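pasting input
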Amino acid sequence: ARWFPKTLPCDVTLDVSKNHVIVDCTDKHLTEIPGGIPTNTTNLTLTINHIPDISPASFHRLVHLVEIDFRCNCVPIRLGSKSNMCPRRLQIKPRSFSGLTYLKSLYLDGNQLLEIPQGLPPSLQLLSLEANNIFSIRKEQLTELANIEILYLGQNCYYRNPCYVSYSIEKDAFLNLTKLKVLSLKDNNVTTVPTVLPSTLTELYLYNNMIAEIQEDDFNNLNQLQILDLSGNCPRCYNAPFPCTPCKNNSPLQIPVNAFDALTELKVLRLHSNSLQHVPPRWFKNINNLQELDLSQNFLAKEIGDAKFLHFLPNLIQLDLSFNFELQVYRASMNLSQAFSSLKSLKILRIRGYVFKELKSFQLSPLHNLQNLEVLDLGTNFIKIANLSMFKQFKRLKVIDLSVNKISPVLEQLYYFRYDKYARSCSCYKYGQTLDLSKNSIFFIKSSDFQHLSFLKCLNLSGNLISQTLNGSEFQPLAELRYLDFSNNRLDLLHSTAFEELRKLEVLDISSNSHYFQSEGITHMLNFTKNLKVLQKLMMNDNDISSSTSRTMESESLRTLEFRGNHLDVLWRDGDNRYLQLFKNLLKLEELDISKNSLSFLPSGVFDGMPPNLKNLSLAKNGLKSFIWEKLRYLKNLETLDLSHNQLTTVPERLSNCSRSLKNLILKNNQIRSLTKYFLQDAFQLRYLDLSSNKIQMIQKTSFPENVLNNLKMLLLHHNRFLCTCDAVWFVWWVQHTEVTIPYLATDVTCVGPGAHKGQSVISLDLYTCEL
Amino acid sequence: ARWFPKTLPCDVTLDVSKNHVIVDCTDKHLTEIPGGIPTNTTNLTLTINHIPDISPASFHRLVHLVEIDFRCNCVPIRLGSKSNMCPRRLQIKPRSFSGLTYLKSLYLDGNQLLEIPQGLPPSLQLLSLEANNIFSIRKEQLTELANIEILYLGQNCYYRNPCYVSYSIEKDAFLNLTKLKVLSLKDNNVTTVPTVLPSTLTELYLYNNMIAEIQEDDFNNLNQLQILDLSGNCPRCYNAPFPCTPCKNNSPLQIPVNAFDALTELKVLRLHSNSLQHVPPRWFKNINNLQELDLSQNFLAKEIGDAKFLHFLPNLIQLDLSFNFELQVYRASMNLSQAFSSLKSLKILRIRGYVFKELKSFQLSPLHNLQNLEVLDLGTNFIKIANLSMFKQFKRLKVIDLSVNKISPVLEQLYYFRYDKYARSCSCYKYGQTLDLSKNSIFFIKSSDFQHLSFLKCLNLSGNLISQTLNGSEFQPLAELRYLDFSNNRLDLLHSTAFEELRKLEVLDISSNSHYFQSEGITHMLNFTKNLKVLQKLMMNDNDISSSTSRTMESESLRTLEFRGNHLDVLWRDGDNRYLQLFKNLLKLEELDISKNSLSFLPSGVFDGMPPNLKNLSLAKNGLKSFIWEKLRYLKNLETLDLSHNQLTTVPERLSNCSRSLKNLILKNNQIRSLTKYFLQDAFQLRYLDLSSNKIQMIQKTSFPENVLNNLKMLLLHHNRFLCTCDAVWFVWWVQHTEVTIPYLATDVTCVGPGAHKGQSVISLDLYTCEL
Ligand SMILES: *[C@@H]1O[C@H](CO)[C@@H](O[C@@H]2O[C@H](CO)[C@@H](O)[C@H](O)[C@H]2NC(C)=O)[C@H](O)[C@H]1NC(C)=O
Ligand SMILES: *[C@@H]1O[C@H](CO)[C@@H](O[C@@H]2O[C@H](CO)[C@@H](O)[C@H](O)[C@H]2NC(C)=O)[C@H](O)[C@H]1NC(C)=O
Ligand SMILES: CCCc1nc2c(N)nc3ccccc3c2s1
Ligand SMILES: CCCc1nc2c(N)nc3ccccc3c2s1
Ligand SMILES: *[C@@H]1O[C@H](CO)[C@@H](O)[C@H](O)[C@H]1NC(C)=O
Ligand SMILES: *[C@@H]1O[C@H](CO)[C@@H](O)[C@H](O)[C@H]1NC(C)=O
Ligand SMILES: *[C@@H]1O[C@H](CO)[C@@H](O)[C@H](O)[C@H]1NC(C)=O
Ligand SMILES: *[C@@H]1O[C@H](CO)[C@@H](O)[C@H](O)[C@H]1NC(C)=O
Ligand SMILES: *[C@@H]1O[C@H](CO)[C@@H](O)[C@H](O)[C@H]1NC(C)=O
Ligand SMILES: *[C@@H]1O[C@H](CO)[C@@H](O)[C@H](O)[C@H]1NC(C)=O
Ligand SMILES: *[C@@H]1O[C@H](CO)[C@@H](O)[C@H](O)[C@H]1NC(C)=O
Ligand SMILES: *[C@@H]1O[C@H](CO)[C@@H](O)[C@H](O)[C@H]1NC(C)=O
Ligand SMILES: *[C@@H]1O[C@H](CO)[C@@H](O)[C@H](O)[C@H]1NC(C)=O
Ligand SMILES: *[C@@H]1O[C@H](CO)[C@@H](O)[C@H](O)[C@H]1NC(C)=O
Ligand SMILES: *[C@@H]1O[C@H](CO)[C@@H](O)[C@H](O)[C@H]1NC(C)=O
């Protein structure tokens, strides 16, 4: 099927449209650039390997290279692996790049380089040198970059990669880079804004440095600047999770009132963690296009009640005023200036970490007529009191976020407090209006608590303290609710009428409501599903369900049931038949997850008891030690079977004879040591087979008929125990010449033996001695 | 050190005391009785093997056998492994036991026997046949048991081991068993009490059967009976976790009013789950010695408010009325009859599952003058209101249990509801008075909540809804508290004054209070420990701690700190030195658990940062990929180092150079593939070494000098990858001949090769070809 097997340890892709031959050698544990890279190579990535030097031999035949991605072949010690530390810096010999006359993009990040590499071709638009050791920039070393448009030099002098001096930039070092659009000098122990910069700049990143003052003319010529980030200069260090040095005397970064006067094109201004106490309106006199303003992690608590500068921001789309609270102050309420009402274009307002006790309808009145307002984020404010009905005036919003508060009767986890959220490494909103009350202190709910909110489509009550029996009266206003996240509470299913007032409910999450399931003898009405006539998806993961008063759950609508992390092993205790049809009357059910239920065996009757349209079944992570494969015949619509992370030792003698419908068979992470002689014979439906991470020693042709392998979209075989003796001649030859997609041939389809061949990839294996 | 290596795959112990030779072959995957069993063997256990038959050859030389424990060599099929089912029942040939003329105890449980084995010696006092298929007892078949004292025949006909008919016992089958003290016929589908029974009986177990009526004279001659259990006849089936058939007409077990008149000696009466609605006082007029009465799982809800029968029980110690509630009734209060006040000897009263809304001092008055009352258990009652001060009147008690209730302003998990609490298979109480409020709904605490309870020594608040900052004022009444379990709440360590009013506190558990530690930017005062001057043990496990406002925790008293399941990997992020002395000022800390902290490496300074008296250090389950063993020099009092379940690949070149103090080195479950040349040389201090579940191939004498192994109390070596070539000659020889204790030599210390030897035990390995 192939005449010339591919030995090269890299994935090779063709994009015929834009004549790219893409060679990806990412993370292939290479010590040398592999031989045989196609000479038509346009994109070549060698990121995360251990190639210790580059030379003219490196790319010698690769004349058409347009991009070389050579990041992280010698990561700085504190940022890289401690088990495989890099012994010496990358070495780049002369002329290594000069012949590549079409090279447009060169990334050399994370290689412990000490200088800007010279000899670069004049075609280069993008040079990336992050996380190296270059902390002195001289105009001489930048003459070669005449046509450069994007230049990343950050992370070369900071706490994860110290240089122990101030960064240095000669005057007008960048000024003759006349074509330069993007300059990044973040995380560099820079002490002043470098001047003069080329007026072609559209983006300037100077954040996380030691710039204490802006000079009035530091940005005088940047009439095309669109994004400017000065954050993390004079940081606000309270509860910082990284080493943090504030400016002396609690000074802020000092910005003259006229410092921005030239930036007419500015669209994004970021002044995060600059220890600001005031925001002069004069700052924005000449910026009418500003769309995004980050003022998080300053000391603007008082200014938020005044905030005259908002009158100069009629086109602002995003405003972030999070974490401006005064230390050790717990304000009574939020004092939002009337000036917010002049934010006519505002879509997103974030004020986390203002820290106040009580939220009242009128305090949000400055926002009532912001017509384009879509997201209001008041999370992490320790609000104790809030009448939810006030959001009846905010029905136009897409998300109201009150997450992580103490109310009673999507951004990264680390976001406002991480050092460099843009650091490069080597959900129910779609349903409509969302009220996020997650991680609050609601211990009891009542119908009137939701009143005037019948417009809500998604309500997140995850992670409250609700230890209550529901009887159908608690949610009555919520006539349009489609999604209820009730996870991480203490739901008590005493009555089978719970949730029945949510007539339009399509998704219910009651996972991690294990509390009342963990004490013996307590009544549990699992048959509450019957009353929910449009319910599509039910999640009850991690509930430790080991007993149930009702014997059957019923639904004519339910399509997906997640039941992972429970104790079906106890419910189905061998000899107890009462619950073998717990799911039989979920008539429309197509997907069932009963992984992690400690099912080390399946009792008689489990398969016969499944609902008739079951398509996707997971029995993963059960400690399954045995499996009667014939009983799949009961599952006449079964299309996906996930048996991963179990203890199986055998596959069926004839998979076609067990399931005529089975299309995807997942057996990864088991104990299988051999395949049956006619395993896949006539399994014409099979499309996907994962046998990886087992203990298979040999595979013979009878098990793998090629009319079956031809239809496989993927066949996974890596991390097994293959013996590369002359008995493996067909398997080795087939693996080398087949077109079937088999991931990891280059890294993890290997011989364990015999002696000579140990550790060797079967793709590279030469068995001519077997036919002498 | 030994002249004759032990081949026998059984543990052999001598108790010269009573001259017994104990051979224990439990769970050794035997298909045979091993050859070579010592001929002095007195106790021989073969439990959990797959020996298919017994014969006269089985024990023929084992003349002095006093006990044969042969359980579970063919378990009933729903009770045993489904991956290794037993193919055919155990076969016992004639004459197998007749020569064993000293045999006193014979266990044959769980072998699928169809009849009581005949031919047994007349010395036998104890015969055990539980979980077989013997469901017809004939007087003829018990002639051989003249001198029997203890006879277990239960679990031969029940839902885990069905016989599909009623149990049958011929009339007077047991009466000529004139020495029979204990007869157990539980779990047997028995329909009537067998008569006549021998009057020597002291214990009679008839529970979990189908007995509908007791006859007047069913116990007429029992004269000496001390324990009688009739539980589970006419069971109360509501929320039963096993198949449960109630008696018709909701009838109770019918017991005539005079049925117990002969039982002068009766000390324990068990009538659990008999569906009783009344307890006629006349039952007890002739039993004044009764000490333990179980009336749980009946319908005694109203009877508890009357209970005149309590007047006849002045010597009762334990009384159980748990789960007597009327279905679908949520009573307003608990109505205890005054008759309780006449239980002058009562030590333990349990009334779970009475199910009522409000508890008031006034309802507990019948117990005020019960002088010996030690345990009051009102758990699982769904109590919503309870003034804790009422217990000022119960300070003589050892435990007050309000666990699993809804209060807001040790028995097995499965106990009242499991089928057979006594089924045989193949804590702060010690600190003083304990108020157990675990698993309630307390969301806010205040000093007055504890008024008048200054006597408390242990308070259990685990698993409430406490989401509160503590400032040192909340517990002030609890002047003598020694133990506070605050686990599974949402503690907010805003103030370092938390818990300081507990001036006597020795153990503080704030594990699983992760909530506020999981959201970025929140203040955490881990240095709150300084104020706790007698604090001994601090558990802050599973808190997801990844940030801290203070840099150091301080205590002059704390000895043990459990810090497992947190994120020291983040706190000690490489490049951030600020928290490398988090534990340095716990001056007298001796045990530190920092397992499960994702520490894939230890930054330099962690060890120097440890407090000076650190004795027991766990770094288990961190994914540690490397370890600078030399830094153990900083830990000069280190005695236990637990590095289990990591990814280490090497041991120190010179363990004596790394620690002159280390006694226990646990390296189980790592990736170690060889030992260093002189690993343990001069490690005279080492006493315990676990290298199990690694990839070690060979061990040479240089690494294992015998001056070091002589002192080892245990050396764990199993589940490695030993190569049994002529290079292994010394290791094989030493293992076969050594004194030193090595677990699993018979089952999991094995050669992986070379061919022929694969799978073979190194204890059985013959390497004579290596010396031809
Ligand atoms: C940023 O530059 C400062 C100096 O401007 C470096 O600080 C010096 O560091 C050395 C070595 O730690 C000290 O001996 C000097 O006293 C420091 N000088 C001053 C003025 O503080 C600092 O190390 C640089 N930062 C990084 C992360 O490399
Ligand atoms: C206990 O004995 C009863 C009979 O007393 C068994 O019930 C019979 O079971 C067979 C087979 O299932 C049925 O055909 C009979 O009709 C049943 N008879 C009655 C009267 O119920 C029962 O199976 C036995 N229980 C156990 C656990 O072995
Ligand atoms: C053995 C207890 C049987 C019961 N189960 C529950 C329950 N899940 N919720 C309640 C809520 C209020 C009152 C009583 C209850 C009871 S009583
Ligand atoms: C917002 C980040 C700084 C803060 N941390 C906490 C905290 N642990 N508990 C509180 C309790 C009440 C009010 C405010 C707080 C704050 S404010
Ligand atoms: C390939 O490299 C070129 C040159 O930098 C780049 O513009 C393009 O986006 C890359 N495409 C892929 C698929 O790698
Ligand atoms: C809110 O704060 C502003 C600025 O500090 C102050 O001028 C104003 O009086 C305050 N108003 C209210 C209603 O608190
Ligand atoms: C909450 O506000 C609404 C106004 O929309 C009002 O009807 C209701 O009474 C308020 N509830 C409370 C408890 O203040
Ligand atoms: C609800 O919020 C929790 C916690 O913030 C989050 O994990 C979950 O994804 C949210 N639910 C939905 C449906 O988005
Ligand atoms: C359900 O409970 C609520 C609150 O306890 C109550 O208002 C309502 O009447 C109850 N419904 C029924 C049918 O009892
Ligand atoms: C659910 O099952 C319980 C337990 O048998 C039953 O009492 C109740 O009526 C059922 N309810 C529904 C809605 O099916
Ligand atoms: C499986 O194979 C046997 C033998 O060919 C055949 O009789 C049977 O119909 C096949 N299919 C099923 C679903 O049993
Ligand atoms: C040995 O067996 C005898 C006979 O049943 C038993 O009484 C005794 O407790 C056992 N002793 C030991 C040390 O195992
Ligand atoms: C308590 O229950 C008893 C028993 O039925 C009844 O006679 C009595 O009236 C009840 N007393 C109270 C105070 O409820
Ligand atoms: C407190 O109660 C919990 C919940 O039942 C229990 O797990 C824990 O062991 C108790 N604490 C102590 C110190 O006994
Ligand atoms: C705990 O540490 C914080 C911050 O380092 C400090 O403000 C506070 O006073 C300390 N409290 C103690 C040591 O009790």
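fyi The longest helix of chain A spans residues 729-737.
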